[PDB]
Design a protein around this motif. Sequence first.
Motif, mmCIF file in Angstrom:
data_model
loop_
_atom_site.group_PDB
_atom_site.id
_atom_site.type_symbol
_atom_site.label_atom_id
_atom_site.label_comp_id
_atom_site.label_asym_id
_atom_site.label_seq_id
_atom_site.Cartn_x
_atom_site.Cartn_y
_atom_site.Cartn_z
ATOM 1 N N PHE A 1 10.039 17.759 -10.797
ATOM 2 C CA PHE A 1 10.565 17.568 -9.452
ATOM 3 C C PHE A 1 11.960 18.157 -9.308
ATOM 4 C CE2 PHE A 1 12.745 14.492 -6.463
ATOM 5 C CZ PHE A 1 12.346 15.166 -5.333
ATOM 6 N N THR A 2 12.742 18.165 -10.387
ATOM 7 C CA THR A 2 14.090 18.710 -10.320
ATOM 8 C C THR A 2 14.097 20.226 -10.198
ATOM 9 O OG1 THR A 2 14.177 18.661 -12.736
ATOM 10 C CG2 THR A 2 15.106 16.799 -11.542
ATOM 11 N N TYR B 1 14.346 18.975 -4.218
ATOM 12 C CA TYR B 1 15.420 18.291 -4.926
ATOM 13 C C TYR B 1 16.726 19.068 -4.831
ATOM 14 C CZ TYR B 1 18.149 16.537 -8.849
ATOM 15 O OH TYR B 1 19.152 16.041 -9.645
ATOM 16 N N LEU C 1 0.826 -1.199 0.000
ATOM 17 C CA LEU C 1 0.000 0.000 0.000
ATOM 18 C C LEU C 1 0.862 1.252 0.000
ATOM 19 C CD1 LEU C 1 -3.241 0.380 0.381
ATOM 20 C CD2 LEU C 1 -2.545 1.271 2.589
ATOM 21 N N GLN C 2 1.752 1.375 0.988
ATOM 22 C CA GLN C 2 2.550 2.596 1.088
ATOM 23 C C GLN C 2 3.482 2.748 -0.111
ATOM 24 O OE1 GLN C 2 6.119 2.722 3.520
ATOM 25 N NE2 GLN C 2 5.216 1.191 4.883
ATOM 26 N N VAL C 3 4.076 1.645 -0.569
ATOM 27 C CA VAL C 3 5.032 1.709 -1.671
ATOM 28 C C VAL C 3 4.338 2.167 -2.946
ATOM 29 C CG1 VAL C 3 6.467 0.278 -3.165
ATOM 30 C CG2 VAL C 3 6.651 0.061 -0.716
ATOM 31 N N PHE C 4 3.263 1.478 -3.322
ATOM 32 C CA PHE C 4 2.585 1.800 -4.562
ATOM 33 C C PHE C 4 1.843 3.124 -4.486
ATOM 34 C CE2 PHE C 4 3.733 -2.460 -5.248
ATOM 35 C CZ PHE C 4 3.673 -2.701 -6.596
ATOM 36 N N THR C 5 1.467 3.591 -3.294
ATOM 37 C CA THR C 5 0.875 4.920 -3.199
ATOM 38 C C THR C 5 1.922 6.005 -3.394
ATOM 39 O OG1 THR C 5 1.045 4.678 -0.805
ATOM 40 C CG2 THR C 5 -1.076 4.284 -1.814
ATOM 41 N N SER C 6 3.124 5.812 -2.849
ATOM 42 C CA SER C 6 4.196 6.763 -3.119
ATOM 43 C C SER C 6 4.541 6.779 -4.603
ATOM 44 C CB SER C 6 5.420 6.422 -2.277
ATOM 45 O OG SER C 6 5.938 5.156 -2.630
ATOM 46 N N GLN C 7 4.564 5.605 -5.233
ATOM 47 C CA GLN C 7 4.816 5.548 -6.670
ATOM 48 C C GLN C 7 3.693 6.213 -7.458
ATOM 49 O OE1 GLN C 7 5.420 1.400 -7.462
ATOM 50 N NE2 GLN C 7 7.234 1.297 -6.151
ATOM 51 N N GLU C 8 2.451 6.048 -7.004
ATOM 52 C CA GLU C 8 1.319 6.700 -7.648
ATOM 53 C C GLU C 8 1.436 8.212 -7.556
ATOM 54 O OE1 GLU C 8 -2.376 5.270 -6.174
ATOM 55 O OE2 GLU C 8 -3.564 6.247 -7.736
ATOM 56 N N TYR C 9 1.832 8.721 -6.390
ATOM 57 C CA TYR C 9 2.058 10.155 -6.240
ATOM 58 C C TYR C 9 3.154 10.635 -7.179
ATOM 59 C CZ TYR C 9 3.614 14.528 -4.109
ATOM 60 O OH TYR C 9 4.002 15.829 -3.887
ATOM 61 N N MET C 10 4.239 9.865 -7.286
ATOM 62 C CA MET C 10 5.345 10.265 -8.147
ATOM 63 C C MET C 10 4.931 10.282 -9.613
ATOM 64 S SD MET C 10 8.361 8.199 -6.202
ATOM 65 C CE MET C 10 9.569 8.393 -7.507
ATOM 66 N N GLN C 11 4.055 9.360 -10.017
ATOM 67 C CA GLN C 11 3.522 9.410 -11.376
ATOM 68 C C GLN C 11 2.581 10.592 -11.554
ATOM 69 O OE1 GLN C 11 1.780 5.895 -12.988
ATOM 70 N NE2 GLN C 11 3.647 4.666 -12.794
ATOM 71 N N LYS C 12 1.751 10.863 -10.546
ATOM 72 C CA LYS C 12 0.731 11.898 -10.664
ATOM 73 C C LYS C 12 1.361 13.274 -10.811
ATOM 74 C CE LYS C 12 -3.955 12.268 -8.840
ATOM 75 N NZ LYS C 12 -4.786 12.094 -7.625
#
Lengths: 186, 69, 103, 486, 57, 100, 274, 66, 55
Positions: free
Chosen positions: C30-31, C36, C14-25
Amino acid sequence: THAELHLFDLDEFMQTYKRLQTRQDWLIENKCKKSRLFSYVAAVIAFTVGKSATMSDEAILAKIDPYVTSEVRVQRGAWWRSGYFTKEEVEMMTPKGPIARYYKFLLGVRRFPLKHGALSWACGFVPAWLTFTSLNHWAQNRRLNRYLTQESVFGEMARELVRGKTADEATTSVMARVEKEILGVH
Amino acid sequence: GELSEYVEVNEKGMPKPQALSLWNMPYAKRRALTKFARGVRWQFIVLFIALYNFKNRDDSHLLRRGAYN
Amino acid sequence: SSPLVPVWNDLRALQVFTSQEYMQKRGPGFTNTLEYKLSCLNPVKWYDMMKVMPGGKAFVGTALGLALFGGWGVEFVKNISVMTKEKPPIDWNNEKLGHLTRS
Amino acid sequence: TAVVKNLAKLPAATSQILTNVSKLQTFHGLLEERRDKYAPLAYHTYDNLKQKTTWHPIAHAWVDEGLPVSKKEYNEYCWLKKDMQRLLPLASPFVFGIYGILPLAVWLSNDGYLPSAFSSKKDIVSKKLEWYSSYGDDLRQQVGPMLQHRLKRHLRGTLNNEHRLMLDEVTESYKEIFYSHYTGQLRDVRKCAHLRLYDGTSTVLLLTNKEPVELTSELLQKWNAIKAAKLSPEEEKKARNEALIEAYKEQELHGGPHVKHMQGYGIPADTPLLGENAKGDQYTQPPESASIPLEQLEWTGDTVFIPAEYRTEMEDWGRELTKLANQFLLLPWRFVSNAWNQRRLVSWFEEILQEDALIAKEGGVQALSDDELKVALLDRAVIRCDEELTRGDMEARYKEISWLMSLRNPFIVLAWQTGYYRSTYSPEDDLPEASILPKLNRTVLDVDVHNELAPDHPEKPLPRVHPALYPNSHLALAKEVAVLAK
Amino acid sequence: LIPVSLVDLININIIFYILLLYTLLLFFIPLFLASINYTYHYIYKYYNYNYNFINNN
Amino acid sequence: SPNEHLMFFDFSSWLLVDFGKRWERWVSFKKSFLTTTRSPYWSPQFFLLTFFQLRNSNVKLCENWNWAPKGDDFNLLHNSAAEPFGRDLKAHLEREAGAK
Amino acid sequence: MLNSNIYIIIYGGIIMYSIMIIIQMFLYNFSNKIYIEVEINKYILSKNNIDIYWIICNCTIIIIITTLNHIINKIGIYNMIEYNICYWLIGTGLGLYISPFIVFGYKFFVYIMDLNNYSLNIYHNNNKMNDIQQIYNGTNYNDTMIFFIKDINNIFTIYRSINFFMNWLYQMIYYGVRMWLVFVLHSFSLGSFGELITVITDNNLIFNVFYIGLLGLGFILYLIVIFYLGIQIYVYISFSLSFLHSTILLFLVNYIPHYNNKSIFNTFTNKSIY
Amino acid sequence: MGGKASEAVTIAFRFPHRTTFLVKQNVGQKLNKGHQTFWQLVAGGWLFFLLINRTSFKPKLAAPKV
Amino acid sequence: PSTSPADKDVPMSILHTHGLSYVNWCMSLAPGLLVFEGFFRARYYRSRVPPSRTV
Ligand SMILES: CCCCCCCCCCCCO[C@@H]1O[C@H](CO)[C@@H](O[C@H]2O[C@H](CO)[C@@H](O)[C@H](O)[C@H]2O)[C@H](O)[C@H]1O
């Protein structure tokens, strides 16, 4: 190459009669500790800077390029697919530390590359080894010099050892004074 | 099976549920739950125990010296 | 092992794929953020991204973390059962014993 | 003894040592100047466990085809590098103290421990042959059989697990390569190439702006043709990209590259969209390069060699087999990781390949002398000095190992080499009796390299057909005929 | 009971026993490896290269 | 007895080892070895034979523990003291009266 | 004197009793070799099999030898040695414990130091954000402000890397203690019953006779003792190896399918292109 | 007590990637290297750092002045 | 220094031994050796048959 031989017996004396240790002796030992700890960092820096003088551009790109710093976690196919990772994405994956920046600057610096092996490693280890050993040696020398000018029991023991006396004789000579002046013999 | 720190994935790239499904709730609720979660469980427990013992630490050795007089 | 393992696996996913979902969204950009640009100058980030590098850097990171902070962590764990215990006053050194004139 | 004999020339040796160091510096300057503009960047790669570097000759052993250098000068370069390696005990007093002179005495005792300067001879070939016949062949003749056993037991495995690890098609070739000292028959190098069947298919992915494409014989032939036509770059790049897109379509029809379906390697699919990022049915997010049209497919100049050595790779060899491979080749081996010995072996490999190229430039093997060819074979580790072969046998031996090293696989190279170092001793004085037949003679024609050989089936080996018996052999062997008759 | 003792948990005498035992083991390994298998006899006797000759006619 | 069978009384003697004297003689041998060889400080000999000893001594001399270990300065069993009120005070006064 | 720190060691019969344990190994000649061959090939397939095999063989045969010396050659230490806990924990258990770490220590160390970089393991990890999280942030998980507690985290992560190597230690200790308890308690109970019988018969001399027989009772007790202790030693060895499999050797399962080669007589190289 | 290997991933799941040797064409990137006098100044700074941190052993401080 | 006191030197005589019981003697495993020495000797030296003539 001669102070450590006295400092052995002096340290044994100090460990036994640690009750007779003042604050300044403690500060001397702490300063030797500080020098010893900084010697590790100096050795690491010297190792990097020495080995970098014999590393080809490939050996440096192994440490900069995220193609090589990602071999543990990432498939190599993610890097062969063009567009899988974007430019900003590849940029955030690069190491940002001072060693990485030093090497990035060192790409355009002339040096004397060697094949990756024992000589490229020794050209860092030798300066690092000499730095570490010499810094610790001079730290012990400074420690002994500080003890000799110290008006304390340990200073007297160090002085008596520097004359050229034996450990047992110096222990007896100093304990004869400790029993009288410090402990107040009956 | 049921290995530790392990999870399978389906064709959609999604984790398959081993015991319990929690992917029905919206992304906002999941982000609210997981924004403060970490990959660490027992260290927080040990830290709460340490904070309890620190709140309930002994100060008699300071009373003997007169720091509370 | 316990039977709660799949529960913990589900929560980890849950936490891993939600962080990945946020990063995709949030997508690119980000740079350009301050987070960063500050992490680029942050030694915690240097250490954390050097840990996963190859060439024994995992061992280097683990041993460095140990030598620096894990010793204090061992002491902290040892001190959890010491904070609640009655201890005596600290017999502070009078700094009178040890002085002796040279001769 | 030899200690005082070498101390007598130690004053006369320092001048030669410094002169040799200067020669080495000049030659390395030239070689690196050429390498830094003509050679590609062979990136560093770590092993499967990702703690130490791994090395392969296909990527790291570059051959400067066009090196304006004499073969003897390259021999001098390599031999003086080895002399620099042998000069290392001079550091012992500068790290241990004045009592670090007994290691220097042990160094000066044996002449094989020493560099060239302590030798009375002058020519590099005579010096090298003296060193070999005095120390090196003897040192190599006591590592060969044990290395052979380690290679065998690396293939077949430990603890009676041959039925799980060995292959039933490499069986007769394995026997002919490793147990021909029982029969006394010669070996065919192709039967050693059959050992590569333990491995997978070696591929080469060319990296483009869109996708990686697997290299094939057809694409390589087309690229060589375009390179030979000497066209303008506006036409050269166009034809290269045409062949590239053709090969891309061909492999997409084949079912993708071979690497997608190989354990340990793989190409990721399109990335997934997680949760609410999924836009209905489009569960994927293609890469940026998907926007580029396929007609703009251009080669990035980057290549990825994938040997797929699942059983032959030098990583899985071990702490001992690597050391013995470096011992047998008279390389440094002590007190180093297998990565450093891997690099040393690959550097030896590169040296041998460059020497082969320079020999081919100088007019082949027949242009060489007898001592020079003997020394070349000694460097290749296929001859021992207690044989006294003919010239034709030496030439065939050179051709054999040269073709075998062209394949860029150290395991089969060592398997071939160790077969020439299996010598026995009899317990009796009368036996072995004096032979009646003449010495073994061969020719370059007897070596079959220009033909393929299928692996003989287990317990059904076939006889050897001479290349001359093949049809149109006089046309295929015409080069060797012209070289030999002249 | 006698064997129920913390003194017998890290007994240096048994450690000397183990030390001498495994040093002697190490000393005698090259004699334990000195057993002969008859597999290479089999390979020598049974490995028969193809001895037939080529005859185009 | 059965317990008599579970006993090892095959002892021979008591080995007495003055580890202080042995350590002193070891250090003396190290000093003699480093002086006779005239070895420098950057040598592996000097390093192995000096650095760890000096490090451990500096560590044991720099240590400034506010409190001694667990079972030496606290966490100790102590019989409860007599209180200045209630029954203990009455017993104390009765003792003082009876003695005097 | 002050500097004299004195230690008293303990010393007894060790040398001549340890020499014959090794001298007997030439007589036994590793009769247990086939059993351990079978079991090792059941539990693992690698190039380093023979190594671990040899270790176990040595360990096992020594145990067997001691057991027989404990049953037959009753002198001095051979009686106590199986009744002592130090022998069962350090003389049998420690070697078996450290055997896989001495054979496969490279891989286990690399694994352990990689697990300190704790991360969620995904099967068919064709994800892209996973890579960025693992490289940039170091882990799949959220590591934000965990450096704040790094002092504990490090050591805790260290246990997190070795927690799946710990049940091997537990099983070794458990079975050493089990063997110690078995030998001690059974010997004590048997001797106690014998002594009670002797008390019954000494006070009644009509029964103080060789009532079962001189050899009958002795032969029966010999068979009982050897059967029971052989069963216990077989249990110890077999369970130790099954737990070695289930605890330490399943990490090393790497099955590689056989892929056919095609480019045997020709290899693409840097010179083919460049 | 403690975990097992059956309850965890293998050494092949972690570290699953085999080796692939990357090569890159030479455009001339490792040419015209500047800072020819860099290592001289680096060695000078190293020797300076060693000199400022140098301390000779002065046993004359132990002379019997009293 | 090393010592060798006279307390360890004491009188010895087999007459003063308490001894063993019939049960303890059976537990000494001598009766087992008595049988199994012959058993194993018989098995070894009877496995190897010599040549003969059938009458
Ligand atoms: C398959 C059988 C299942 C039923 C199991 C029954 C339990 C059997 C336990 C067998 C183990 C007992 O182990 C055995 O104990 C006896 C009794 O002390 C020991 O016997 C020894 O000590 C006793 C104690 O008085 C002495 O009297 C005796 O003379 C001596 O031999 C043996 O040396 C030991 O080998």
